[PDB]
Amino acid sequence: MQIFVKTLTGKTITLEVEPSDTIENVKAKIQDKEGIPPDQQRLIFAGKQLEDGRTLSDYNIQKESTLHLVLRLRGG
Amino acid sequence: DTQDDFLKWWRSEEAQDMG
Numbered sequence: 001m002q003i004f005v006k007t008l009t010g011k012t013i014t015l016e017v018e019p020s021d022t023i024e025n026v027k028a029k030i031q032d033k034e035g036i037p038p039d040q041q042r043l044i045f046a047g048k049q050l051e052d053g054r055t056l057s058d059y060n061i062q063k064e065s066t067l068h069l070v071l072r073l074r075g076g
Numbered sequence: 077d078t079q080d081d082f083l084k085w086w087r088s089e090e091a092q093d094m095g
Contacts (some may be wrong), residue, residue, distance in 0.1 A: 008090065073091070
């Protein structure tokens with residue numbers, strides 16, 4: 001299952017994530033692929049806030065699905 | 077088809093500088 005995480009700026013990257021795998025596992029891979037901490041970027045889909053402790057199938061996230069990302073400005 | 081509608085608000089909402 002290779003989905004496409006699209007950010008606000010307009011960055012859609014192909015990221016593979018199992019449906020059972022929680023959002024943390026996704027932000028996890030996305031964190032090691034882009035360098036964005038799980039608690040630094042907020043993802044949204046179908047008007048639902050993807051919580052760190054939530055599954056994908058719950059938000060009807062299919063393959064190549066466009067997952068909205070929100071990069072939290074101001075780091076450290 | 078209001079997926080980007082509400083998201084568009086988050087774009088500028090996150091891009092703050094002077095206000």
